[PDB]
Protein backbone atom coordinates (compact mmCIF):
# COMPACT_ATOMS: atom_id res chain seq x y z
CA UNK A 1 0.00 0.00 0.00
CA UNK A 2 1.60 3.12 -1.03
CA UNK A 3 -1.27 5.34 -0.73
CA UNK A 4 -4.52 5.67 0.98
CA UNK A 5 -6.91 8.19 1.66
CA UNK A 6 -10.81 7.88 2.86
CA UNK A 7 -13.06 10.70 3.98
CA UNK A 8 -16.83 10.72 5.89
CA UNK A 9 -18.69 13.64 5.39
CA UNK A 10 -20.68 12.45 8.10
CA UNK A 11 -21.18 8.64 9.51
CA UNK A 12 -23.61 6.03 8.17
CA UNK A 13 -25.46 3.71 10.18
CA UNK A 14 -24.56 1.25 7.62
CA UNK A 15 -21.15 1.43 7.78
CA UNK A 16 -19.11 -1.14 6.41
CA UNK A 17 -14.74 0.64 6.85
CA UNK A 18 -14.70 0.93 10.29
CA UNK A 19 -13.91 -1.16 13.57
CA UNK A 20 -16.33 -0.59 16.56
CA UNK A 21 -14.95 -1.34 19.70
CA UNK A 22 -16.75 -0.49 23.16
CA UNK A 23 -19.59 1.69 23.14
CA UNK A 24 -19.23 3.64 20.00
CA UNK A 25 -22.27 3.47 17.96
CA UNK A 26 -23.29 5.88 14.98
CA UNK A 27 -26.78 8.08 15.92
CA UNK A 28 -29.58 8.58 13.68
CA UNK A 29 -28.08 12.04 13.06
CA UNK A 30 -25.24 10.40 11.53
CA UNK A 31 -22.97 11.36 14.15
CA UNK A 32 -20.42 8.81 15.48
CA UNK A 33 -21.03 8.39 19.07
CA UNK A 34 -18.06 7.19 20.87
CA UNK A 35 -18.84 6.85 24.90
CA UNK A 36 -22.24 5.31 26.08
CA UNK A 37 -25.82 6.98 26.35
CA UNK A 38 -28.66 6.17 28.40
CA UNK A 39 -32.43 5.30 26.85
CA UNK A 40 -32.55 9.81 26.59
CA UNK A 41 -29.19 10.36 25.09
CA UNK A 42 -27.84 11.54 28.13
CA UNK A 43 -23.79 10.53 28.65
CA UNK A 44 -23.05 7.59 31.22
CA UNK A 45 -20.16 7.07 33.76
CA UNK A 46 -17.59 4.37 32.89
CA UNK A 47 -17.56 4.25 29.34
CA UNK A 48 -14.98 3.85 26.48
CA UNK A 49 -15.66 3.82 22.94
CA UNK A 50 -13.24 3.77 20.09
CA UNK A 51 -13.35 3.22 15.82
CA UNK A 52 -10.54 1.97 13.79
CA UNK A 53 -10.57 2.35 9.68
CA UNK A 54 -10.40 -0.97 8.58
CA UNK A 55 -7.60 -0.10 5.90
CA UNK A 56 -4.31 -0.84 7.52
CA UNK A 57 -1.71 2.48 6.72
CA UNK A 58 2.18 1.33 6.02
CA UNK A 59 3.96 4.16 8.33
CA UNK A 60 7.29 2.75 7.49
CA UNK A 61 9.26 0.43 5.38
CA UNK A 62 12.01 -1.41 6.92
CA UNK A 63 13.43 -2.74 3.89
CA UNK A 64 13.45 0.43 2.07
CA UNK A 65 13.60 3.71 4.83
CA UNK A 66 10.70 4.90 3.53
CA UNK A 67 8.13 6.69 5.68
CA UNK A 68 4.67 7.82 5.07
CA UNK A 69 3.26 11.82 5.43
CA UNK A 70 -0.17 12.03 6.52
CA UNK A 71 -2.88 14.60 6.62
CA UNK A 72 -6.24 14.01 8.62
CA UNK A 73 -8.99 16.51 9.35
CA UNK A 74 -11.92 15.46 11.93
CA UNK A 75 -14.64 17.85 13.43
CA UNK A 76 -16.19 16.79 17.08
CA UNK A 77 -18.54 18.49 19.56
CA UNK A 78 -18.92 17.48 23.39
CA UNK A 79 -21.74 17.47 25.23
CA UNK A 80 -22.73 17.14 29.28
CA UNK A 81 -25.04 18.07 32.45
CA UNK A 82 -22.03 18.80 34.19
CA UNK A 83 -19.39 21.15 35.70
CA UNK A 84 -16.00 19.20 35.68
CA UNK A 85 -17.51 17.09 31.94
CA UNK A 86 -15.05 14.10 31.12
CA UNK A 87 -12.79 12.44 29.94
CA UNK A 88 -11.99 13.56 26.52
CA UNK A 89 -11.35 12.08 23.13
CA UNK A 90 -8.20 11.48 21.29
CA UNK A 91 -7.36 11.06 17.10
CA UNK A 92 -4.66 8.01 17.40
CA UNK A 93 -2.57 5.61 15.37
CA UNK A 94 -1.68 2.10 17.07
CA UNK A 95 -0.85 -1.57 15.95
CA UNK A 96 -3.71 -2.88 13.83
CA UNK A 97 -4.47 -5.11 16.49
CA UNK A 98 -4.79 -2.61 19.32
CA UNK A 99 -8.21 -3.36 21.34
CA UNK A 100 -9.67 -0.66 24.71
CA UNK A 101 -6.92 -1.76 27.13
CA UNK A 102 -8.80 -2.80 30.91
CA UNK A 103 -9.28 0.25 33.17
CA UNK A 104 -9.25 2.62 30.35
CA UNK A 105 -12.17 4.03 31.31
CA UNK A 106 -11.53 7.65 32.58
CA UNK A 107 -8.52 9.67 32.27
CA UNK A 108 -7.20 7.18 30.42
CA UNK A 109 -9.10 8.06 27.78
CA UNK A 110 -9.47 4.65 26.36
CA UNK A 111 -5.79 4.46 25.27
CA UNK A 112 -4.25 3.30 28.29
CA UNK A 113 -3.76 0.35 30.96
CA UNK A 114 -3.48 2.16 34.65
CA UNK A 115 -0.17 -0.29 35.10
CA UNK A 116 1.57 0.99 32.05
CA UNK A 117 -0.10 4.09 31.23
CA UNK A 118 3.14 6.09 31.92
CA UNK A 119 5.63 3.31 30.82
CA UNK A 120 6.69 4.23 27.27
CA UNK A 121 8.70 0.83 26.90
CA UNK A 122 4.55 -0.50 27.16
CA UNK A 123 2.73 1.01 24.70
CA UNK A 124 2.59 2.13 21.31
CA UNK A 125 0.81 4.74 20.23
CA UNK A 126 0.43 8.55 18.84
CA UNK A 127 -2.32 9.97 20.43
CA UNK A 128 -3.42 13.62 19.91
CA UNK A 129 -6.25 14.41 23.30
CA UNK A 130 -8.42 17.04 23.85
CA UNK A 131 -8.71 16.52 27.33
CA UNK A 132 -11.53 18.51 29.22
CA UNK A 133 -10.92 16.67 32.64
CA UNK A 134 -7.60 17.81 35.02
CA UNK A 135 -8.47 16.93 38.90
CA UNK A 136 -5.35 16.63 40.05
CA UNK A 137 -5.54 14.18 42.21
CA UNK A 138 -6.58 11.43 39.98
CA UNK A 139 -5.47 12.58 36.58
CA UNK A 140 -1.74 13.27 38.08
CA UNK A 141 -0.40 13.73 34.62
CA UNK A 142 -1.85 16.47 33.87
CA UNK A 143 -1.55 20.12 33.79
CA UNK A 144 -4.67 21.84 35.99
CA UNK A 145 -6.35 23.27 33.12
CA UNK A 146 -8.02 21.79 29.64
CA UNK A 147 -5.72 21.29 26.98
CA UNK A 148 -5.16 19.33 23.94
CA UNK A 149 -1.82 17.14 24.06
CA UNK A 150 0.30 15.41 21.59
CA UNK A 151 0.98 11.89 23.77
CA UNK A 152 3.72 9.41 22.97
CA UNK A 153 3.48 6.15 24.75
CA UNK A 154 2.18 7.70 27.55
CA UNK A 155 -1.12 9.20 28.84
CA UNK A 156 1.76 11.93 29.91
CA UNK A 157 1.68 14.37 26.71
CA UNK A 158 5.11 15.29 25.54
CA UNK A 159 3.60 18.62 24.70
CA UNK A 160 0.57 20.29 25.88
CA UNK A 161 -1.50 24.00 25.21
CA UNK A 162 -4.38 25.42 27.23
CA UNK A 163 -7.77 24.71 25.16
CA UNK A 164 -11.17 25.24 25.98
CA UNK A 165 -14.26 23.03 26.13
CA UNK A 166 -17.58 24.82 24.68
CA UNK A 167 -20.00 23.09 25.80
CA UNK A 168 -22.05 21.52 22.83
CA UNK A 169 -19.64 23.58 20.13
CA UNK A 170 -17.81 22.23 17.02
CA UNK A 171 -13.52 21.84 17.20
CA UNK A 172 -12.51 21.74 14.07
CA UNK A 173 -9.32 19.82 13.73
CA UNK A 174 -6.06 19.84 11.04
CA UNK A 175 -3.42 17.37 12.28
CA UNK A 176 -0.33 16.23 10.22
CA UNK A 177 3.00 14.22 10.24
CA UNK A 178 5.93 15.37 8.41
CA UNK A 179 8.30 12.64 8.04
CA UNK A 180 11.17 15.00 6.97
CA UNK A 181 10.95 17.03 9.85
CA UNK A 182 9.60 14.36 11.89
CA UNK A 183 6.70 17.02 13.21
CA UNK A 184 3.35 16.25 14.52
CA UNK A 185 1.82 19.56 13.34
CA UNK A 186 -1.98 20.37 14.91
CA UNK A 187 -4.23 22.96 14.34
CA UNK A 188 -7.82 23.67 15.58
CA UNK A 189 -10.70 26.18 15.65
CA UNK A 190 -13.50 27.42 16.73
CA UNK A 191 -16.06 28.65 14.38
CA UNK A 192 -15.84 32.69 15.78
CA UNK A 193 -11.85 32.37 14.68
CA UNK A 194 -10.41 30.67 18.50
CA UNK A 195 -7.44 28.85 17.56
CA UNK A 196 -5.02 26.30 18.67
CA UNK A 197 -1.58 25.38 17.96
CA UNK A 198 0.62 22.75 18.96
CA UNK A 199 3.50 20.48 17.59
CA UNK A 200 5.90 17.81 18.78
CA UNK A 201 8.96 16.50 17.34
CA UNK A 202 9.03 12.48 17.27
CA UNK A 203 10.07 10.29 14.78
CA UNK A 204 6.86 7.84 14.28
CA UNK A 205 9.29 5.23 13.21
CA UNK A 206 10.73 4.92 16.38
CA UNK A 207 7.16 4.57 18.54
CA UNK A 208 5.12 2.51 15.84
CA UNK A 209 5.26 -0.68 13.92
CA UNK A 210 5.24 -0.68 10.13
CA UNK A 211 1.66 -1.02 9.35
CA UNK A 212 -1.01 0.89 11.90
CA UNK A 213 -4.11 1.67 12.21
CA UNK A 214 -5.94 5.37 12.71
CA UNK A 215 -8.68 6.24 14.47
CA UNK A 216 -10.60 7.81 17.38
CA UNK A 217 -10.93 7.16 21.33
CA UNK A 218 -12.94 8.47 23.78
CA UNK A 219 -13.83 7.96 27.11
CA UNK A 220 -15.85 9.09 30.61
CA UNK A 221 -15.38 7.58 34.16
CA UNK A 222 -16.88 9.13 37.48
CA UNK A 223 -17.53 11.81 35.49
CA UNK A 224 -18.91 12.35 31.79
CA UNK A 225 -19.91 13.55 28.88
CA UNK A 226 -21.17 12.61 24.78
CA UNK A 227 -18.19 12.78 22.84
CA UNK A 228 -19.51 13.00 19.14
CA UNK A 229 -17.40 12.36 15.99
CA UNK A 230 -18.71 14.46 13.16
CA UNK A 231 -16.69 14.30 10.40
CA UNK A 232 -13.15 12.60 9.22
CA UNK A 233 -10.75 12.76 6.10
CA UNK A 234 -7.62 11.08 6.36
CA UNK A 235 -4.76 11.32 3.53
CA UNK A 236 -0.91 9.25 3.52
CA UNK A 237 1.42 8.52 1.17
CA UNK A 238 4.47 6.56 1.07
CA UNK A 239 7.36 8.41 0.00
CA UNK B 1 -17.69 6.31 3.50
CA UNK B 2 -18.10 9.41 1.13
CA UNK B 3 -14.43 8.92 -0.48
CA UNK B 4 -11.90 6.39 -0.89
CA UNK B 5 -8.37 6.04 -2.90
CA UNK B 6 -5.57 3.47 -2.91
CA UNK B 7 -2.84 2.70 -4.79
CA UNK B 8 0.27 -0.09 -5.05
CA UNK B 9 3.07 1.28 -7.51
CA UNK B 10 4.28 -2.39 -7.09
CA UNK B 11 2.75 -4.98 -4.77
CA UNK B 12 4.22 -5.77 -1.07
CA UNK B 13 4.70 -9.53 0.22
CA UNK B 14 3.63 -8.23 2.99
CA UNK B 15 0.50 -6.30 2.18
CA UNK B 16 -2.13 -6.05 5.00
CA UNK B 17 -5.24 -4.66 2.60
CA UNK B 18 -5.53 -7.28 0.44
CA UNK B 19 -7.81 -10.56 0.31
CA UNK B 20 -6.18 -13.04 -1.73
CA UNK B 21 -8.26 -15.87 -3.34
CA UNK B 22 -7.40 -19.14 -4.93
CA UNK B 23 -3.54 -19.04 -6.51
CA UNK B 24 -2.92 -15.30 -6.09
CA UNK B 25 0.29 -14.47 -4.18
CA UNK B 26 2.76 -11.40 -4.31
CA UNK B 27 6.23 -12.61 -6.33
CA UNK B 28 9.80 -11.76 -5.15
CA UNK B 29 9.60 -9.02 -7.90
CA UNK B 30 6.58 -6.88 -6.24
CA UNK B 31 4.37 -8.73 -9.11
CA UNK B 32 1.27 -9.54 -8.11
CA UNK B 33 1.04 -13.23 -9.79
CA UNK B 34 -2.31 -14.12 -9.94
CA UNK B 35 -2.63 -17.39 -11.30
CA UNK B 36 -0.50 -20.54 -10.13
CA UNK B 37 3.29 -21.32 -11.17
CA UNK B 38 5.43 -24.41 -10.64
CA UNK B 39 8.07 -24.52 -9.12
CA UNK B 40 10.30 -23.02 -12.00
CA UNK B 41 7.89 -20.02 -12.17
CA UNK B 42 5.90 -21.83 -15.81
CA UNK B 43 2.08 -21.47 -15.81
CA UNK B 44 -0.50 -24.09 -15.30
CA UNK B 45 -3.00 -25.59 -16.17
CA UNK B 46 -6.38 -25.16 -13.97
CA UNK B 47 -6.15 -22.21 -11.76
CA UNK B 48 -7.68 -19.53 -10.47
CA UNK B 49 -6.56 -16.57 -8.58
CA UNK B 50 -8.25 -13.25 -7.01
CA UNK B 51 -7.36 -10.08 -5.36
CA UNK B 52 -10.11 -7.34 -3.57
CA UNK B 53 -9.06 -4.54 -1.73
CA UNK B 54 -10.03 -4.63 2.24
CA UNK B 55 -11.97 -1.65 1.77
CA UNK B 56 -15.26 -1.53 0.68
CA UNK B 57 -16.74 1.22 -1.72
CA UNK B 58 -20.35 2.79 -1.35
CA UNK B 59 -21.29 2.23 -4.99
CA UNK B 60 -25.05 4.05 -4.30
CA UNK B 61 -27.24 5.10 -1.45
CA UNK B 62 -30.78 3.81 -1.48
CA UNK B 63 -31.90 6.11 1.24
CA UNK B 64 -30.07 9.49 -1.04
CA UNK B 65 -30.07 8.42 -3.88
CA UNK B 66 -26.30 8.99 -4.42
CA UNK B 67 -24.24 7.39 -7.28
CA UNK B 68 -20.32 6.96 -6.73
CA UNK B 69 -18.05 7.83 -9.62
CA UNK B 70 -14.39 5.67 -9.99
CA UNK B 71 -11.35 6.18 -11.91
CA UNK B 72 -8.77 2.97 -11.90
CA UNK B 73 -5.56 2.91 -13.45
CA UNK B 74 -3.47 -0.61 -13.55
CA UNK B 75 -1.28 -2.31 -15.51
CA UNK B 76 0.05 -6.17 -16.33
CA UNK B 77 1.62 -8.17 -18.66
CA UNK B 78 0.62 -12.15 -19.68
CA UNK B 79 3.50 -14.58 -20.26
CA UNK B 80 3.13 -18.24 -21.65
CA UNK B 81 5.45 -20.81 -23.83
CA UNK B 82 2.22 -22.12 -25.87
CA UNK B 83 0.55 -20.41 -29.54
CA UNK B 84 -2.62 -20.56 -27.62
CA UNK B 85 -2.36 -19.01 -24.08
CA UNK B 86 -5.28 -18.59 -21.65
CA UNK B 87 -7.11 -17.14 -20.07
CA UNK B 88 -7.16 -13.93 -19.48
CA UNK B 89 -7.12 -11.04 -16.59
CA UNK B 90 -10.43 -8.93 -15.67
CA UNK B 91 -10.66 -5.46 -13.10
CA UNK B 92 -14.10 -6.40 -11.70
CA UNK B 93 -16.47 -5.07 -8.87
CA UNK B 94 -18.59 -7.46 -7.43
CA UNK B 95 -20.66 -7.79 -3.36
CA UNK B 96 -18.17 -7.60 -0.57
CA UNK B 97 -18.91 -11.39 0.29
CA UNK B 98 -17.73 -12.79 -3.69
CA UNK B 99 -15.75 -15.79 -3.73
CA UNK B 100 -14.20 -17.43 -6.80
CA UNK B 101 -17.13 -20.08 -8.66
CA UNK B 102 -16.37 -23.34 -8.73
CA UNK B 103 -15.77 -24.32 -12.44
CA UNK B 104 -14.06 -20.98 -13.43
CA UNK B 105 -10.91 -22.02 -13.88
CA UNK B 106 -11.00 -21.58 -17.91
CA UNK B 107 -13.18 -18.82 -19.69
CA UNK B 108 -14.95 -17.73 -17.16
CA UNK B 109 -12.03 -16.04 -15.80
CA UNK B 110 -12.58 -16.75 -12.30
CA UNK B 111 -15.99 -14.79 -12.01
CA UNK B 112 -18.63 -16.75 -12.97
CA UNK B 113 -20.26 -20.79 -12.42
CA UNK B 114 -20.49 -23.20 -15.99
CA UNK B 115 -24.36 -23.42 -14.54
CA UNK B 116 -25.23 -19.17 -14.66
CA UNK B 117 -22.37 -18.06 -16.42
CA UNK B 118 -24.29 -16.74 -19.30
CA UNK B 119 -27.90 -16.04 -16.66
CA UNK B 120 -27.41 -12.49 -15.51
CA UNK B 121 -30.70 -12.74 -13.42
CA UNK B 122 -28.03 -14.73 -11.45
CA UNK B 123 -24.88 -13.14 -11.04
CA UNK B 124 -23.74 -9.45 -9.91
CA UNK B 125 -20.54 -8.42 -11.30
CA UNK B 126 -19.14 -5.79 -14.02
CA UNK B 127 -15.92 -6.56 -14.92
CA UNK B 128 -13.55 -5.37 -17.86
CA UNK B 129 -12.14 -8.50 -19.60
CA UNK B 130 -8.59 -8.52 -21.27
CA UNK B 131 -9.28 -12.04 -22.85
CA UNK B 132 -6.65 -14.28 -24.86
CA UNK B 133 -8.00 -17.31 -25.81
CA UNK B 134 -11.36 -17.68 -27.97
CA UNK B 135 -11.48 -21.52 -29.12
CA UNK B 136 -15.02 -21.05 -31.20
CA UNK B 137 -16.15 -24.80 -29.66
CA UNK B 138 -15.55 -23.82 -25.46
CA UNK B 139 -15.56 -20.35 -25.27
CA UNK B 140 -18.71 -20.41 -27.49
CA UNK B 141 -19.88 -16.85 -26.30
CA UNK B 142 -16.63 -14.84 -27.75
CA UNK B 143 -14.98 -13.18 -30.62
CA UNK B 144 -13.09 -15.10 -32.76
CA UNK B 145 -10.18 -12.93 -31.98
CA UNK B 146 -8.61 -11.59 -28.42
CA UNK B 147 -10.53 -8.77 -27.30
CA UNK B 148 -11.26 -6.53 -24.67
CA UNK B 149 -14.68 -6.65 -23.28
CA UNK B 150 -17.33 -4.92 -20.48
CA UNK B 151 -18.91 -7.35 -18.65
CA UNK B 152 -22.16 -7.31 -16.99
CA UNK B 153 -23.74 -10.10 -15.19
CA UNK B 154 -22.36 -12.38 -18.10
CA UNK B 155 -19.48 -13.45 -19.57
CA UNK B 156 -20.66 -12.70 -22.42
CA UNK B 157 -19.80 -9.20 -23.04
CA UNK B 158 -21.77 -6.24 -23.11
CA UNK B 159 -19.29 -4.86 -25.03
CA UNK B 160 -16.16 -5.83 -27.12
CA UNK B 161 -13.48 -4.44 -28.97
CA UNK B 162 -9.93 -6.43 -30.49
CA UNK B 163 -7.46 -6.73 -29.06
CA UNK B 164 -3.80 -7.93 -29.70
CA UNK B 165 -2.18 -10.32 -26.54
CA UNK B 166 1.66 -8.75 -27.14
CA UNK B 167 3.82 -11.58 -25.58
CA UNK B 168 5.76 -10.29 -22.33
CA UNK B 169 4.51 -7.23 -22.88
CA UNK B 170 2.67 -5.01 -20.04
CA UNK B 171 -0.62 -2.79 -20.96
CA UNK B 172 -1.40 -0.21 -19.17
CA UNK B 173 -5.08 0.74 -18.73
CA UNK B 174 -7.70 3.65 -17.60
CA UNK B 175 -11.22 2.22 -16.14
CA UNK B 176 -13.76 5.01 -15.32
CA UNK B 177 -17.10 4.76 -14.87
CA UNK B 178 -19.22 7.91 -14.80
CA UNK B 179 -22.79 7.59 -12.41
CA UNK B 180 -24.15 10.72 -14.48
CA UNK B 181 -24.35 9.55 -17.97
CA UNK B 182 -23.94 5.95 -16.79
CA UNK B 183 -21.03 5.02 -19.07
CA UNK B 184 -17.87 2.43 -18.40
CA UNK B 185 -15.20 3.93 -20.48
CA UNK B 186 -12.06 2.04 -20.95
CA UNK B 187 -8.85 3.26 -22.41
CA UNK B 188 -5.43 0.87 -22.64
CA UNK B 189 -1.93 1.31 -24.23
CA UNK B 190 1.12 -0.32 -25.13
CA UNK B 191 4.25 1.57 -24.69
CA UNK B 192 4.15 2.07 -28.60
CA UNK B 193 1.02 4.20 -28.55
CA UNK B 194 -1.19 1.23 -29.90
CA UNK B 195 -4.39 2.27 -28.17
CA UNK B 196 -7.48 0.22 -27.55
CA UNK B 197 -11.07 2.57 -26.51
CA UNK B 198 -14.09 0.57 -25.19
CA UNK B 199 -17.16 1.96 -23.36
CA UNK B 200 -21.05 0.48 -22.13
CA UNK B 201 -23.85 2.57 -20.88
CA UNK B 202 -25.02 0.84 -17.96
CA UNK B 203 -26.32 1.92 -14.37
CA UNK B 204 -24.57 0.27 -12.01
CA UNK B 205 -27.12 0.58 -9.19
CA UNK B 206 -29.54 -1.74 -11.43
CA UNK B 207 -26.67 -4.92 -11.09
CA UNK B 208 -24.78 -4.03 -7.78
CA UNK B 209 -25.38 -4.10 -4.28
CA UNK B 210 -24.88 -0.87 -2.53
CA UNK B 211 -21.78 -1.91 -0.95
CA UNK B 212 -18.86 -3.59 -3.33
CA UNK B 213 -15.75 -4.86 -3.57
CA UNK B 214 -13.20 -4.14 -6.46
CA UNK B 215 -9.90 -6.02 -7.88
CA UNK B 216 -9.15 -8.41 -10.19
CA UNK B 217 -9.23 -11.60 -11.33
CA UNK B 218 -7.50 -14.28 -14.15
CA UNK B 219 -7.92 -18.08 -14.51
CA UNK B 220 -6.56 -20.77 -16.84
CA UNK B 221 -8.21 -23.72 -17.92
CA UNK B 222 -6.60 -26.60 -20.28
CA UNK B 223 -4.59 -23.57 -21.81
CA UNK B 224 -2.37 -21.27 -19.40
CA UNK B 225 -0.13 -18.29 -19.16
CA UNK B 226 0.91 -15.91 -16.16
CA UNK B 227 -0.96 -13.24 -15.22
CA UNK B 228 1.13 -10.28 -13.57
CA UNK B 229 -0.75 -7.46 -12.15
CA UNK B 230 2.41 -4.74 -11.74
CA UNK B 231 0.30 -1.71 -10.53
CA UNK B 232 -3.08 -0.74 -9.14
CA UNK B 233 -4.75 2.80 -8.25
CA UNK B 234 -8.17 3.49 -7.50
CA UNK B 235 -10.12 6.46 -6.89
CA UNK B 236 -14.12 6.82 -5.53
CA UNK B 237 -16.09 9.77 -4.69
CA UNK B 238 -19.68 9.52 -3.32
CA UNK B 239 -21.20 12.47 -5.15
C1 LIG C 1 -15.87 12.90 41.07
O1 LIG C 1 -14.84 12.12 40.49
C2 LIG C 1 -13.58 12.60 40.71
O2 LIG C 1 -13.18 12.34 42.12
C3 LIG C 1 -13.08 10.90 42.42
C4 LIG C 1 -12.56 10.74 43.83
O3 LIG C 1 -11.37 11.46 43.97
C5 LIG C 1 -12.17 10.16 41.42
O4 LIG C 1 -12.23 8.75 41.67
C6 LIG C 1 -12.57 10.44 40.01
O5 LIG C 1 -11.63 9.82 39.08
C7 LIG C 1 -12.27 9.02 38.17
O6 LIG C 1 -13.14 9.85 37.27
C8 LIG C 1 -12.35 10.79 36.46
C9 LIG C 1 -13.27 11.64 35.60
O7 LIG C 1 -14.10 10.80 34.82
C10 LIG C 1 -11.33 10.05 35.60
O8 LIG C 1 -10.52 11.03 34.95
C11 LIG C 1 -10.46 9.18 36.47
O9 LIG C 1 -9.57 8.41 35.62
C12 LIG C 1 -11.25 8.26 37.34
O10 LIG C 1 -11.97 7.32 36.50
C13 LIG C 1 -12.64 11.90 39.74
O11 LIG C 1 -11.32 12.47 39.86
C1 LIG D 1 -6.74 -27.52 -25.73
O1 LIG D 1 -7.84 -27.03 -24.98
C2 LIG D 1 -8.87 -26.57 -25.74
O2 LIG D 1 -9.61 -27.71 -26.35
C3 LIG D 1 -10.25 -28.57 -25.34
C4 LIG D 1 -11.06 -29.63 -26.04
O3 LIG D 1 -11.94 -29.02 -26.95
C5 LIG D 1 -11.15 -27.76 -24.38
O4 LIG D 1 -11.62 -28.61 -23.33
C6 LIG D 1 -10.40 -26.61 -23.78
O5 LIG D 1 -11.30 -25.78 -22.97
C7 LIG D 1 -10.81 -25.61 -21.70
O6 LIG D 1 -9.55 -24.79 -21.74
C8 LIG D 1 -9.79 -23.43 -22.25
C9 LIG D 1 -8.49 -22.66 -22.32
O7 LIG D 1 -7.86 -22.67 -21.06
C10 LIG D 1 -10.82 -22.70 -21.39
O8 LIG D 1 -11.10 -21.45 -22.02
C11 LIG D 1 -12.08 -23.51 -21.29
O9 LIG D 1 -12.99 -22.85 -20.38
C12 LIG D 1 -11.84 -24.91 -20.84
O10 LIG D 1 -11.34 -24.89 -19.48
C13 LIG D 1 -9.79 -25.76 -24.83
O11 LIG D 1 -10.83 -25.15 -25.63
C1 LIG E 1 7.71 -0.98 31.77
O1 LIG E 1 7.14 -1.98 30.92
C2 LIG E 1 8.03 -3.03 30.53
C3 LIG E 1 7.23 -3.95 29.64
O2 LIG E 1 5.98 -4.28 30.23
C4 LIG E 1 8.58 -3.75 31.77
O3 LIG E 1 9.53 -4.72 31.37
C5 LIG E 1 9.21 -2.74 32.72
O4 LIG E 1 9.64 -3.38 33.92
C6 LIG E 1 8.21 -1.63 33.05
N1 LIG E 1 8.81 -0.65 33.94
C7 LIG E 1 8.37 -0.44 35.18
C8 LIG E 1 9.10 0.61 35.97
O5 LIG E 1 7.43 -1.08 35.66
C1 LIG F 1 -31.34 -17.93 -13.97
O1 LIG F 1 -30.99 -17.87 -12.59
C2 LIG F 1 -32.09 -17.71 -11.69
C3 LIG F 1 -31.49 -17.65 -10.30
O2 LIG F 1 -30.58 -18.72 -10.09
C4 LIG F 1 -33.08 -18.86 -11.86
O3 LIG F 1 -34.21 -18.64 -11.02
C5 LIG F 1 -33.50 -18.99 -13.32
O4 LIG F 1 -34.36 -20.12 -13.50
C6 LIG F 1 -32.27 -19.11 -14.21
N1 LIG F 1 -32.66 -19.20 -15.61
C7 LIG F 1 -32.43 -20.29 -16.35
C8 LIG F 1 -32.89 -20.22 -17.77
O5 LIG F 1 -31.88 -21.28 -15.88
CA1 LIG G 1 -7.33 14.24 31.80
CA1 LIG H 1 -12.31 -16.33 -23.64
MN1 LIG I 1 -4.10 15.21 29.42
MN1 LIG J 1 -14.48 -12.82 -23.83
Chains 1, 2 share one sequence.
Not at 41 to 68: C, D, Y
Not at 93 to 110: C, F, M, R, Y
Not at 218 to 225: D, I, K, Y
Amino acid sequence: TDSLSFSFINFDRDERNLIFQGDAHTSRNNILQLTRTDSNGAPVRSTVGRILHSAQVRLWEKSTNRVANFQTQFSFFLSSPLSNPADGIAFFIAPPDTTIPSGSAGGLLGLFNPRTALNESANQVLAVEFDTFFAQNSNTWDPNYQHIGIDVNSIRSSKVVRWERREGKTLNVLVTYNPSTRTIDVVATYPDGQRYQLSHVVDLTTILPEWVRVGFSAASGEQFQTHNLESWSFTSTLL
